Amino acid sequence: MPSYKSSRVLVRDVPEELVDHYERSHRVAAFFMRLLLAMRREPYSLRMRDGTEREVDLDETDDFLRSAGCEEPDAVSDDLRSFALAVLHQDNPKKRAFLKSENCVSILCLEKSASGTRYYKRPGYQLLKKALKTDTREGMAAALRLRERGVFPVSVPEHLDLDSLKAAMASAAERLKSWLACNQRAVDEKAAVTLCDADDSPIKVRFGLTGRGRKFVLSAAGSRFLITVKLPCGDVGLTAVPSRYFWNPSVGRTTSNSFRIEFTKRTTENRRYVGEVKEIGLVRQRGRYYFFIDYNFDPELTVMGIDLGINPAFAFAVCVSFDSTGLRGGIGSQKLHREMHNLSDRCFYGARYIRLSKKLRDRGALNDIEARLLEEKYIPGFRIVHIEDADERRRTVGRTVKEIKQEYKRIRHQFYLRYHTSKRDRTELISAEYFRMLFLVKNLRNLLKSWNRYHWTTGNPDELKSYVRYYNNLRMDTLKKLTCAIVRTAKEHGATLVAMENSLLSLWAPGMVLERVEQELKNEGILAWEVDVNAAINIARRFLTR
RNA sequence: GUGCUGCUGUCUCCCAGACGGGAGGCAGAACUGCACCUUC
DNA sequence: AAGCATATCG
């Protein structure tokens, strides 16, 4: 029902108290994850930082449960599982024992807890006020039965206040529920957990106003946020570095436990935005502390047909007669695009010439099709001089890969200079060179992957991950800018309805491009639906017939 | 603030095997442009 | 899988 947007703000001088709170929250969250997994008393698998998976048997979980304060698990097993499935939301939603998973911590950890006795929020009590013995869910009944057995108030490894425990339990339950859904999807084929860590896999340490986590206050001074976190040990004050997503912020404490923030998103438009902040998430990434600010926001005949081409970024028609037509995102630099295509082809053919060379080295020519495929296309596409011997051929391939790498670096630098060569004005918002670079890097990653595995016969996870990062980031940026261009063209033309259908399918699944454009068009207030310039005209006409 | 996103100098690890490739850490110069919902 | 609300007694 609600709508969210998000951004991170970096904080530099984090006091020791906040770092200790962060680390303790991560440790207790890992403890809760392991405890909930142990309560199911079923064998599972966990993957560590090295990437290999270990399988934990039932005996280790039994030992952990006995360490956590339950001296006789096998005699109370049916209760524990009955509790755990309630926490992970594996019961009927109508009779949910814990609507939010944090609610169990009072039963889990508190000594003098009175949970499970109060009934003021029961609808029957409300109706009697206006004028439970069987109503109790199995999840709460099992928890009470465990508590009265002297078993359930487990020993938390590190002492924390109730609110921080609730936040840690919330994060742990979220991760475990996601893993459990994945495990169900895997078992239904006819699945490994990942314990949270302070640096290798952080959880969002949450601060909230209603009671989940410690309370927080945020204000704005000039162009930066000032955040005060109300830890039990004091009140830590922080100042975030200015962010161009929140360039000129100004906040107001609302009367409904929320902070209204008004900011300016630095773009060409510099449009003002308003949002509501209610929870804040501290996270550590490579030694730097970022607060995830997730803010709610309020979303806002002329029709268009949109065609998502590859050589043009898109073609639009507006309108019966189409008095407005055009293309957006054409080729900007002819020679750059041509060189990009040539290098992509070179890498594509080299990836196969490597395998053919290995086969020749270890077995010799096998059949006519291998030799002909090498001679007609692999030799000139990877243009290179053939060598009969093994090591000389390997050295020639090495020289060819060096040349390819140098050309790739030059092409990347030229593409980067599109925003800094005093010709920024000529540069368009979107162009086909983005997709061409994506294809080029996808082919080049494969080429280097084949090259690195030359030594072994035909027969670490850090390999080439910089290229993976670049590919993913460039693809995300391309999608963002394409969506921006589409919505900008829609809004400038005053359209109210949009109709829309080595290719796009190889870069994205059929869904997320359409879903992203649909969501962004709806957010601005423009409706859209699924059914060159002629294709866009045809799409618009097809929508018009309906 | 995350990216688009690079260049130069320098340093440390890994795969080879004297042809090359891979992952990062610092120090500079240049430009200050274009978009941004994120975690699992 | 998520990025809160509301009641009650003190």
Added chain:
DNA sequence: GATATG
């Protein structure tokens, strides 16, 4: 304000 449960 501190629990507690929608």
